[PDB]
Amino acid sequence: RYEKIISARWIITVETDGEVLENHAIAIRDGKIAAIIPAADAAGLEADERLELPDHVLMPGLINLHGHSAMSLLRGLADDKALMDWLTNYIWPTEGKHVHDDFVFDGSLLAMGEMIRGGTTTINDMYFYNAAVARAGLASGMRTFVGCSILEFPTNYASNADDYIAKGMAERSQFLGEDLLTFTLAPHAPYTVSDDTFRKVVTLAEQEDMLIHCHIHETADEVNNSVKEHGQRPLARLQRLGLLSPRLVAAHMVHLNDAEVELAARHGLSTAHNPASNMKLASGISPVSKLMDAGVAVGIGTDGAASNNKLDMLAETRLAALLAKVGTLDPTSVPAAAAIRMATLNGARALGIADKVGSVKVGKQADLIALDLAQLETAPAFDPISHVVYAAGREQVSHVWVKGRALMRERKLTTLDESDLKARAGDWRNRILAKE
Amino acid sequence: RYEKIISARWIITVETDGEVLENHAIAIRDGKIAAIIPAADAAGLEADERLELPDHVLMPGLINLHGHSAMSLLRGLADDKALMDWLTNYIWPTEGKHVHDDFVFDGSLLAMGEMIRGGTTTINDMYFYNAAVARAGLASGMRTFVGCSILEFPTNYASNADDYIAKGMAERSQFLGEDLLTFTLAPHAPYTVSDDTFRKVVTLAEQEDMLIHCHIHETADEVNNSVKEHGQRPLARLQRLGLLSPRLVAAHMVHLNDAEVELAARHGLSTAHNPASNMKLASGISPVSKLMDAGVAVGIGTDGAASNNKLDMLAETRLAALLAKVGTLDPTSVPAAAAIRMATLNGARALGIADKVGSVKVGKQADLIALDLAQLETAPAFDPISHVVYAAGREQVSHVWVKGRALMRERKLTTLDESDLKARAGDWRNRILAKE
Numbered sequence: 001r002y003e004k005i006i007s008a009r010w011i012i013t014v015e016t017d018g019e020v021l022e023n024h025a026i027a028i029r030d031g032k033i034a035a036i037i038p039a040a041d042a043a044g045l046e047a048d049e050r051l052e053l054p055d056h057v058l059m060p061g062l063i064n065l066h067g068h069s070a071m072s073l074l075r076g077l078a079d080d081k082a083l084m085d086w087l088t089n090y091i092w093p094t095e096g097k098h099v100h101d102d103f104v105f106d107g108s109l110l111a112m113g114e115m116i117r118g119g120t121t122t123i124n125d126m127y128f129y130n131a132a133v134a135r136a137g138l139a140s141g142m143r144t145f146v147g148c149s150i151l152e153f154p155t156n157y158a159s160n161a162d163d164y165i166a167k168g169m170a171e172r173s174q175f176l177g178e179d180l181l182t183f184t185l186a187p188h189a190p191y192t193v194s195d196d197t198f199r200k201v202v203t204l205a206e207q208e209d210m211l212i213h214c215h216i217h218e219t220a221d222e223v224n225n226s227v228k229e230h231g232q233r234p235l236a237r238l239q240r241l242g243l244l245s246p247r248l249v250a251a252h253m254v255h256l257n258d259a260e261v262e263l264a265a266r267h268g269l270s271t272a273h274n275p276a277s278n279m280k281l282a283s284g285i286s287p288v289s290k291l292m293d294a295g296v297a298v299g300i301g302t303d304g305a306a307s308n309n310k311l312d313m314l315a316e317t318r319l320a321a322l323l324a325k326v327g328t329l330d331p332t333s334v335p336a337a338a339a340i341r342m343a344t345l346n347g348a349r350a351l352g353i354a355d356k357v358g359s360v361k362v363g364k365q366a367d368l369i370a371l372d373l374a375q376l377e378t379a380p381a382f383d384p385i386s387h388v389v390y391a392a393g394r395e396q397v398s399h400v401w402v403k404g405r406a407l408m409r410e411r412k413l414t415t416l417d418e419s420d421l422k423a424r425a426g427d428w429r430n431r432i433l434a435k436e
Numbered sequence: 437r438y439e440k441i442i443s444a445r446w447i448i449t450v451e452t453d454g455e456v457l458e459n460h461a462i463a464i465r466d467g468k469i470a471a472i473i474p475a476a477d478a479a480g481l482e483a484d485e486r487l488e489l490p491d492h493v494l495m496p497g498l499i500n501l502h503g504h505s506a507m508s509l510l511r512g513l514a515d516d517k518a519l520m521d522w523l524t525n526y527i528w529p530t531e532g533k534h535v536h537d538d539f540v541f542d543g544s545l546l547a548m549g550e551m552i553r554g555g556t557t558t559i560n561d562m563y564f565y566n567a568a569v570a571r572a573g574l575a576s577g578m579r580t581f582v583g584c585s586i587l588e589f590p591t592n593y594a595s596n597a598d599d600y601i602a603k604g605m606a607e608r609s610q611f612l613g614e615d616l617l618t619f620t621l622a623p624h625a626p627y628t629v630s631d632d633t634f635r636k637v638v639t640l641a642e643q644e645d646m647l648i649h650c651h652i653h654e655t656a657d658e659v660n661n662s663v664k665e666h667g668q669r670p671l672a673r674l675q676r677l678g679l680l681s682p683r684l685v686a687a688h689m690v691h692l693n694d695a696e697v698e699l700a701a702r703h704g705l706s707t708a709h710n711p712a713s714n715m716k717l718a719s720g721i722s723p724v725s726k727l728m729d730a731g732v733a734v735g736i737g738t739d740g741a742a743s744n745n746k747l748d749m750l751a752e753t754r755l756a757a758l759l760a761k762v763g764t765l766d767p768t769s770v771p772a773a774a775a776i777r778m779a780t781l782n783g784a785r786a787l788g789i790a791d792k793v794g795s796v797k798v799g800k801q802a803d804l805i806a807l808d809l810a811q812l813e814t815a816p817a818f819d820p821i822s823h824v825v826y827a828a829g830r831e832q833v834s835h836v837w838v839k840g841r842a843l844m845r846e847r848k849l850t851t852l853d854e855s856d857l858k859a860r861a862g863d864w865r866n867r868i869l870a871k872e
């Protein structure tokens with residue numbers, strides 16, 4: 001028998017742009033999409049659970065291709081400052097004082113409860129204390145990529161580049177054979193990582209077959225300083241070092257010339273587009289249309305909650321679509337179907353799992369969400385694709401499944417204790433503000 | 437005795453940027469803010485109703501300085517098209533077929549239910565069938581500015597400019613003496629209104645002491661075509677015609693040179709900044725920082741739901757703050773307090789009522805909202821100003837009052853039947869799509 005049969009008014013498949021099935025149902029077995037059939041035919045099949053969702057659209061879960069989940073604990077602590085001031089006087093001293101395993105576990109859990117509430121099923125994270133993020137990911141049941149961050153300078157976590165690498169690999173080894181947990185190597189950025197460290201990352205990722213997750217070309221300063229320090233722009237340096245290949249997920253990628261767009265396409269890297277962070281930090285506008293036109297997989301991330309300050313992939317997908325139009329001055333840039341593909345199947349492509357998740361197709365894993373469109377905010381309901389991108393909100397996600405397992409049902413979290421998350425956040429408020 | 441006493445964890449006054457009162461209470465009588473006092477002192481005062489809101493922030497209601505509320509019925513009907521295509525083949529034929537009193541009343545009600553749900557207390561609207569919008573506004577209890585639209589060409593409503601004017605004035609006369617309902621003159625835009633019609637508007641608005649509400653400098657085409665047709669850019673033309681003065685609310689104001697910023701400041705007009713519409717229609721980025729630095733009141737509107745496609749002033753305020761930073765490449769542009777002021781007190785200034793609404797001050801009318809910040813999306817709760825702008829969402833508004841009267845209580849609409857609104861929207865879906 002099937003484990004579940006979920007019927008819905010609409011299903012946005014993401015198999016082809018614009019495809020929406022009406023009054024169909026998804027049958028699930030072994031954690032995968034077993035059949036996609038007319039809801040009429042579903043009524044007479046055996047299932048452990050049946051669920052009927054009138055006025056809901058079912059769609060693949062959203063894939064947040066770039067986060068720093070534990071920074072949820074720093075959400076709105078300091079805003080609207082010059083960047084040097086914000087980092088030097090607020091963020092870094094706070095991290096130095098507070099970031100240990102406890103902070104990372106609590107902050108990751110808090111982020112995961114927020115992400116699930118908004119229909120995010122996969123997170124591509126990168127932070128410190130990788131065992132804590134992994135523990136949080138297995139607790140939540142999200143599809144989790146834990147990014148083992150690598151920096152040259154000392155932090156609470158590790159003392160130098162070789163130490164970040166060793167500790168990350170050691171923690172990875174405690175979590176082997178977990179289907180929903182994948183460790184990646186995460187050299188932080190070209191301006192915090194030396195040539196020799198990049199070489200070690202290239203060698204290691206090749207030996208162990210790991211993804212590389214790195215902030216690249218976020219700011220004009222980064223790109224201009226690279227030339228003075230390394231004699232060439234960061235992408236050209238990384239090409240020389242062997243970093244550009246299909247295993248690389250390049251976050252931000254804001255400042256690109258046309259030669260660099262072609263470079264990305266030729267090496268098959270993917271990018272994570274982080275529009276709110278790029279706007280809030282005044283980084284600029286990533287040329288996502290150029291990138292996608294060149295054949296590059298452009299997914300969407302939220303970045304950290306201290307520069308967003310939401311972890312809302314629906315809002316981020318809408319912002320990607322809006323920012324693309326104002327940046328190109330073309331109202332046809334990044335149409336709703338394209339934005340949905342960025343938020344789902346492109347994230348899967350970036351992560352090397354597009355054969356397994358990212359669209360509603362038989363044989364793929366059942367990473368799905370349902371949104372209730374019977375609200376004023378999405379009335380009248382003409383076309384669910386348009387509404388998902390331009391009108392629907394995080395509050396309308398009613399159900400979330402990852403590999404067919406319910407993580408949220410009628411907005412009740414099933415794997416995390418929402419009260420506990422609020423209490424951890426409240427504790428951190430007192431600890432960070434020195435209130436008792 | 438007081439009519440109400442509302443205590444809250446935080447009160448953002450908007451009297452001074454950054455001012456937040458902790459554990460205070462608002463006492464209300466005769467529809468006005470009668471006292472702002474420590475919550476401890478409140479417990480021993482007589483009140484018809486007392487309300488306690490732990491973990492909520494109270495703040496002035498949001499003022500949507502530019503809407504076309506009835507277009508809520510066209511939300512997501514057609515998206516991502518070239519502008520000429522969108523208007524010529526989808527929006528205008530649909531309006532021509534469907535827009536009568538019924539459409540305007542139903543669509544206005546639907547918009548008003550969505551606006552109240554998101555903490556909007558005042559709407560500066562402009563559409564056709566002004567009596568229908570007025571009837572809807574009195575039904576909802578929102579503070580409503582009904583904009584009597586004026587165009588040269590015939591529509592279902594009126595046949596020529598003098599006809600729009602006559603019919604608008606006739607409908608205005610049926611709604612006299614209503615404290616929360618104000619009619620304005622709304623010549624649509626420089627490219628749809630003749631010199632002679634602008635002159636008639638100037639004369640009439642002066643005789644009757646009315647606001648003028650007009651789309652100005654939205655697109656590069658508008659501004660460039662003006663020179664060929666009228667020999668000068670639209671603002672200079674409108675200055676020559678007598679249109680620029682403190683009674684003018686100029687919507688959009690995207691394409692401005694520095695001389696035009698100074699022109700606006702010298703004539704005391706206000707602007708309505710509509711970031712989502714300007715992005716979605718690829719109009720450009722209004723230089724709001726320049727305008728505010730020159731002393732111009734810049735408020736925020738959503739425009740119509742067909743080019744947003746939300747009527748969510750929280751999301752619009754956040755977008756204003758984000759777009760300002762990416763447009764200036766300065767992360768300190770439009771800080772959270774400034775964005776809140778744009779969404780509240782600047783809207784009041786534009787509408788000539790800043791002595792009456794827009795901030796939490798004794799003697800002002802009690803147009804207030806409460807947001808519940810005890811959600812993961814706004815945890816940890818460091819500073820409510822930052823959260824209101826960068827993290828909080830429309831779903832967190834729990835209570836709305838206009839002139840001290842509850843329009844929404846624990847997210848239950850008190851003046852509108854939410855089921856009825858959904859049903860009207862559903863009816864319009866069938867009518868517009870030709871389904872039965």
Ligand SMILES: CSC[C@H]1O[C@@H](n2cnc3c(N)ncnc32)[C@H](O)[C@@H]1O
Binds near residue numbers: 068095126149
């Ligand atoms: C893995 S995301 C980057 C992490 O390293 C921190 N970080 C990045 N650059 C610096 C720097 N120059 N000094 C201190 N901390 C840094 C950031 O605040 C974040 O915690």
Ligand SMILES: CSC[C@H]1O[C@@H](n2cnc3c(N)ncnc32)[C@H](O)[C@@H]1O
Binds near residue numbers: 504527528531562
């Ligand atoms: C009062 S907002 C503008 C209204 O007039 C309509 N409109 C504006 N310009 C034109 C035009 N050139 N032809 C037809 N309708 C128009 C818009 O679709 C909207 O309903």
Ligand SMILES: [Zn+2]
Binds near residue numbers: 066304
């Ligand atoms: Zn990042």
Ligand SMILES: [Zn+2]
Binds near residue numbers: 504651
């Ligand atoms: Zn408008």
